Design a protein around this ligand. Structure first.
Ligand SMILES: CO[C@H]1[C@H](O)[C@@H](O)[C@@H](O[C@H]2[C@H](O[C@@H]3CO[C@@H](O)[C@H](O)[C@H]3O)OC[C@@H](O)[C@@H]2O)O[C@@H]1C(=O)O
Length: 389
């Protein structure tokens, strides 16, 4: 059919795409791997965001620095997520019959705010201006870390988040369970101390991607997808095709349905991650690259016919005089797609394709006839068009 791309219907502003680094749990990236992750050259990922963790023990903080420095050097922004407070701030409690359940002590909130602040300060003294810090990773799924109820999160956002010398991300539900975030959005004071609503999407159905309340109360707030792997963490799955195509479809849904402004993967380097263990880019990686390499920080999502044929998914962005279109064909049949540009005129179109047999591989240039151009979308393929204005 037709894909209409309206250059004037502006949507969310994009902050970027990236992944996690965890030297303790995964092993720090090597110098070469840092180039592959944050460089936007040929055979590199052009990740524009790096997540790192706030260790509960300050003596471990130093381990995050080299990789974080590297990301900044390349223009990536860095943010951080805590799993646990320092142990002296944590108590056990009876959570519905589970007595091993950990939480932050009600009289330790201020001290934990200071812990987080110390990390910001520490990172600064090593030449990393942390873009943002989180309150707690997955407080509603904390079997192996620190639990917070919605009300405990609220109290901290009302009373302590304001003392944090950085942008504050909250609440980082594992599944984008609105009940964890509703209380904040419904409280002027807590809302005021939140700069980024953060979430994960483990098991989240596409119908739960929209967030009406956020649209209603969240003016001036960022909306970030701070952790995921998809569609699984199967050992050595990173190269499986057409499986990898799920990655770009997921990002498509985050951008188009969730209106997210950041998409952050889990471990950058892993047998199921964007980067393989030999330090090369996986098929999952190239699926991310179709966004990360072209949709730079600052770009804006624009309205575009999201799903103009069965298994064909489209999203568009504008920035730096270009329109970027990402077209995912998940079917077993090549389709010819017609792309119409409204409220804007263009000339030349470049493109890169990823399929069973190729990675981000240049296609033939195409030219705009009036306000449109035809392009063929190979079977089980992702294409990124770059349109010059
Ligand atoms: C195949 O093993 C991988 C696991 O499937 C994967 O969950 C991850 O496990 C981590 C664990 O990470 C949590 C993953 O779920 C997220 O919701 C949550 O935010 C994470 O904290 O934390 C302990 C760590 O030692 C494990 O590595 O990664 C596994 C892997 O090593 O590949």
């Amino acid at each position: 059919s037709d894909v209409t791309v309206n250059v004037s219907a502006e949507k969310q502003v994009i902050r970027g795409f990236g992944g996690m680094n965890h030297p303790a749990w995964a092993g720090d990236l090597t110098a070469a791997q840092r180039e592959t992750a944050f460089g936007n050259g040929q055979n590199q990922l052009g990740f524009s965001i790096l997540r790192i963790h706030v260790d509960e023990n300050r003596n471990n903080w130093y381990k995050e620095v080299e990789t974080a420095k590297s990301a900044v050097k390349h223009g990536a922004i860095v943010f951080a997520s805590p799993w646990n407070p320092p142990s002296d701030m944590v108590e056990t409690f009876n959570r519905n019959g589970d007595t091993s359940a950990k939480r932050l002590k009600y009289n330790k909130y201020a001290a934990y705010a200071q812990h987080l602040n110390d990390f910001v300060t520490f990172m600064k003294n090593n030449g990393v201006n942390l873009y943002a810090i989180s309150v707690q990773n997955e407080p509603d799924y904390a079997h192996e870390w620190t639990w917070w109820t919605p009300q405990e999160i609220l109290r901290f956002m009302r009373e302590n988040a304001g003392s944090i010398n950085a942008r504050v991300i909250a609440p980082e539900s594992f599944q984008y369970l609105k009940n964890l975030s509703d209380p904040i959005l419904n409280d002027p004071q807590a809302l005021a101390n939140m700069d980024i609503l953060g979430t994960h999407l483990y098991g989240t159905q596409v119908s739960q991607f929209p967030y009406p309340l956020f649209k209603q109360k969240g003016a001036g707030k960022d909306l970030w997808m701070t952790e995921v792997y998809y569609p699984n963490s199967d050992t050595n799955s990173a190269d499986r095709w057409p499986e990898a195509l799920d990655v770009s479809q997921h990002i498509h849904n985050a951008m188009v349905e969730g209106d997210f402004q950041a998409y952050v993967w889990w471990y950058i380097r892993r047998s199921y991650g964007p980067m393989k263990e030999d330090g090369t880019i996986s098929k999952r990686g190239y699926n991310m690259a179709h966004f990360s390499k072209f949709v730079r920080p600052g770009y804006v999502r624009i309205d575009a016919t999201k799903n103009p044929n069965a298994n064909v998914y489209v999203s568009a962005y504008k920035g730096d005089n270009k329109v970027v279109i990402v077209a995912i064909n998940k079917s077993n049949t090549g389709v010819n797609q017609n792309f119409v540009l409204q409220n804007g005129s263009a000339s030349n179109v470049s493109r890169w394709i990823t399929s069973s047999s190729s990675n981000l591989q240049p296609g033939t240039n195409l030219t705009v006839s009036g306000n449109h151009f035809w392009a063929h979308l190979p079977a089980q393929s992702v294409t990124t068009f770059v349109v010059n204005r």
